[PDB]
Design a protein around this ligand. Structure first.
Ligand SMILES: *[C@@H]1O[C@H](CO[C@@H]2O[C@@H](C)[C@@H](O)[C@@H](O)[C@@H]2O)[C@@H](O[C@@H]2O[C@H](CO)[C@@H](O[C@@H]3O[C@H](CO[C@H]4O[C@H](CO)[C@@H](O)[C@H](O)[C@@H]4O)[C@@H](O)[C@H](O)[C@@H]3O)[C@H](O)[C@H]2NC(C)=O)[C@H](O)[C@H]1NC(C)=O
Ligand SMILES: *[C@@H]1O[C@H](CO[C@@H]2O[C@@H](C)[C@@H](O)[C@@H](O)[C@@H]2O)[C@@H](O[C@@H]2O[C@H](CO)[C@@H](O)[C@H](O)[C@H]2NC(C)=O)[C@H](O)[C@H]1NC(C)=O
Ligand SMILES: *[C@@H]1O[C@H](CO)[C@@H](O[C@@H]2O[C@H](CO)[C@@H](O)[C@H](O)[C@H]2NC(C)=O)[C@H](O)[C@H]1NC(C)=O
Ligand SMILES: *[C@@H]1O[C@H](CO)[C@@H](O[C@@H]2O[C@H](CO)[C@@H](O)[C@H](O)[C@H]2NC(C)=O)[C@H](O)[C@H]1NC(C)=O
Ligand SMILES: *[C@@H]1O[C@H](CO)[C@@H](O[C@@H]2O[C@H](CO)[C@@H](O)[C@H](O)[C@H]2NC(C)=O)[C@H](O)[C@H]1NC(C)=O
Ligand SMILES: *[C@@H]1O[C@H](CO)[C@@H](O[C@H]2O[C@H](CO)[C@@H](O)[C@H](O)[C@H]2NC(C)=O)[C@H](O)[C@H]1NC(C)=O
Ligand SMILES: *[C@@H]1O[C@H](CO)[C@@H](O)[C@H](O)[C@H]1NC(C)=O
Ligand SMILES: *[C@@H]1O[C@H](CO)[C@@H](O)[C@H](O)[C@H]1NC(C)=O
Ligand SMILES: *[C@@H]1O[C@H](CO)[C@@H](O)[C@H](O)[C@H]1NC(C)=O
Lengths: 141, 142, 142, 142, 142, 142
């Protein structure tokens, strides 16, 4: 069962940090065509499965994007990662009954895009932490 | 003229805390929560450069159709945050874009509709998200 | 913490092709072929759950003692493959096992010995085996 | 024997992308990602010269027992990659080995067994690894 | 013709034991004693090379008109054996003969008739003979 | 003085598999694929109730003039199947029929003649038909 308490998204300090990190990383992004978290990602996914979908994206973002580039974007990274990780932890006892193929297919497209763009693909992801934060909030509360 | 605000605009004393406290308070009263206003959809088809203009539209709507009309409620928070947002709106009044703003207006339209359809509670939900509107303004315009 | 690499790391055609071509390039220059570095003996006595850790060691050694000292040769493959393998080695830093890693270190040691003893061409053999390293990382860590 | 495909066999326009897409699609459906088919073990006791023959055996099995059957699922990828692999199998007709192929057959046997024992999902896992099979074919036969 | 299943299709003895257990269970309920389905007559006028095709017809009929309606009875055996036989049928969809199949169709007709004429019990007798059908399939198609 | 074999004799997976594999082995060595020892002509004019007795004769002949003399061939199948068939032939030695067995002996004779005339390969053909002998004994005697 996937739900996150809204209180997680209402603290001024950490919210500001997460958004400044997104700004920082985006001021170093060049792709003006591809948006990782957008309409295509949620396409064909019911409201009730969106939090589960976001769980995948968050896991990927911590694992293959944030944990890597830790030596960068200081001192934002140092505060934001623990926070996102706490959230990813809460969502581990969260699953869905049905078929998650269409969902995994959507996430796959995002994972592909990041790996293909390599180094900067990770930069783009971090530049989108503001959309990640908004998506987690809307899908999980 | 241009679409941008000096970072000093978002460093004024305790404006951020107040805005979040206001949002928290109004959130307590938000019955309908299966419906969100600010989020991923709002940005569909909008480039990084256009975001500040998009946020300008949402801020203008929020002030005129939501904040000035509920200015008597959620005190004393309301009184401290509104004037600040009003000045911000004024500072952005010359913010414009060249291309077509059809996508932006269609997105904003969806937000106005949701707020209008929910009546009094639509106004509450809008205030309950001033924190995200504010952080989005900061990111888009500095 | 845990040892895991996302499968997306091993599903990109371009870098996979490069890593395999580099292995082919280096193998077309290996004279010795009477001892396989990555084989049955390396994984013998190692549980499935500890294989990724084991591969962590072998990858560290391959980057450290084999790939950097060689960065010069096998162009332009080496120039693309090394960064890629490095990123993976980086990710596996958080990879730790609780129990005793003596049998594991023993096995890795045997591989390190063989490469050092064959000297110059030992490093060539290792690079010739990147395809097996890539398959081994993929199977052990996803 | 004549185990040598012309390097032109592996440069077809968008064949590589298709094969990887097919493997990605099928991978999504692989529950036993904790069981592996292609990898280090498949090559035990097989010399560089014999690898192309070994891959020939694996390719033949994959086509006859996995692809030619499950041919309806995973469209449109399946229809673009199979015909190509069938021609490759045919092209490997002039490929044989002189010595004893007992080790090679025992290795291939392990692969066939795993695929058969897992029933339908065994077929899925095989397709989920066409990428590694294809890259191993290229390496072994050019 | 494309009838020559890989021997691995019939080498997961778990499946063999299950098929015989299923046959034993259904045999207990076979009141009818005079009539038999599988045996010498079924092969009249069929050459060794044609037997796999003949068995394919019988297997297709047994799956569609027998194992499907009784799928709820004889648990848990039924659930373990059917899927396996279905994959086999599928795997044989790619098997045909050139010459005239009139002798074969006449033989299969005699089997279908016996099964249909006996109604519900004809289905039971058919299941009671899955052991002989299975061993005949193995012999004809590998 | 009854002719009967318990069905349990024909429902054991291990020995059934062996008997059939032995028939496969011996048939892969039969050239004359243009003659059927156990077929329509053998049972022609024989009532259901006398079929077991008829099979008793054929089994005795197959053990005596075909399997015992050929005990060195087709290992290791022969070593397991012959004792099995022998136990069954032993059980049937009391099996008798009251009436006239001229037409029956006439039919068996034709089978004996054919095998002896084809000499060495006639015995091979017989062994290649053990699967039909097994099915015939089962249908006639249970
Ligand atoms: C008909 O019977 C055969 C043979 O039966 C087996 O062998 C006899 C002598 C007795 O010991 C019986 O108890 C056995 O059941 C069956 O084929 C054998 O099947 C078994 C298990 O299904 C196979 O063993 C597997 O071997 C795998 C490794 O394969 C390699 O090693 C074997 C061993 O010698 C070798 O023969 C083969 O060529 C490979 O080199 C291993 O991974 C797995 O765990 C298991 O141990 C055995 O290999 C098969 N033998 C052969 C050559 O057929 C049939 O399954 C059975 N048919 C049916 C439909 O029931
Ligand atoms: C978002 O945070 C920035 C920076 O955070 C400040 O420094 C951190 C190390 C930490 O100590 C935080 O508590 C601080 O707020 C804020 O910008 C700073 O604001 C202070 C006072 O307002 C000022 O003295 C600094 O120079 C500013 N540093 C800059 C230019 O980044 C910013 O106000 C916060 N945003 C909002 C709207 O709340
Ligand atoms: C192999 O492992 C060693 C540690 O055993 C890694 O060394 C670390 O290197 C970083 C700088 O790159 C230092 O900050 C750490 O302090 C080092 N750790 C130790 C043990 O001191 C090394 O980076 C690894 N090699 C690769 C490239 O994977
Ligand atoms: C692996 O990448 C190489 C790139 O080096 C591909 O080979 C080149 O392909 C282009 C376009 O078809 C040809 O014009 C060149 O002749 C090739 N270069 C060389 C020197 O080989 C190759 O196709 C890729 N391999 C696979 C299997 O996709
Ligand atoms: C086949 O039939 C013959 C005769 O019908 C059996 O021969 C008998 O064998 C016993 C035991 O050795 C002797 O005491 C009898 O005198 C034999 N009778 C005849 C007519 O010779 C033989 O045992 C049978 N073989 C099998 C295995 O069925
Ligand atoms: C049994 O045999 C029939 C005919 O050989 C098989 O084919 C029928 O069903 C298929 C389903 O995919 C169709 O694609 C075929 O066109 C259709 N053919 C006819 C003439 O109806 C059927 O799949 C077989 N079933 C089994 C159990 O193998
Ligand atoms: C991410 O997912 C893996 C398994 O897919 C899990 O083991 C790991 O703990 C997760 N990390 C988080 C909470 O992001
Ligand atoms: C909104 O925009 C209108 C002009 O389109 C302007 O007159 C009005 O004052 C604005 N609202 C605020 C408070 O900025
Ligand atoms: C596979 O091998 C068999 C046996 O040699 C051969 O008859 C068949 O044509 C081959 N199939 C493929 C797909 O190459």
């Amino acid at each position: 069962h996937c739900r996150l308490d809204k209180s997680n998204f209402q603290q001024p300090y950490i919210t500001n940090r997460t958004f400044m990190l997104a700004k920082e990383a985006s001021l170093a992004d060049n792709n003006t065509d591809v948006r990782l978290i957008g309409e295509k990602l949620f396409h064909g996914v019911s409201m009730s499965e969106r939090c589960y979908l976001m769980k995948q994206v968050l896991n990927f973002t911590l694992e293959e994007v944030l944990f890597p580039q830790s030596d960068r974007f200081q001192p934002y990274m140092q505060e934001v990662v623990p926070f996102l990780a706490r959230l990813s932890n809460r969502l581990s006892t969260c699953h869905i009954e049905g078929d998650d193929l269409h969902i995994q297919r959507n996430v796959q497209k995002l994972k592909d895009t990041v790996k293909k763009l390599g180094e900067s693909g990770e930069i783009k992801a971090i530049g989108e932490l503001d959309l990640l934060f908004m998506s987690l909030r809307n899908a999980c509360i």
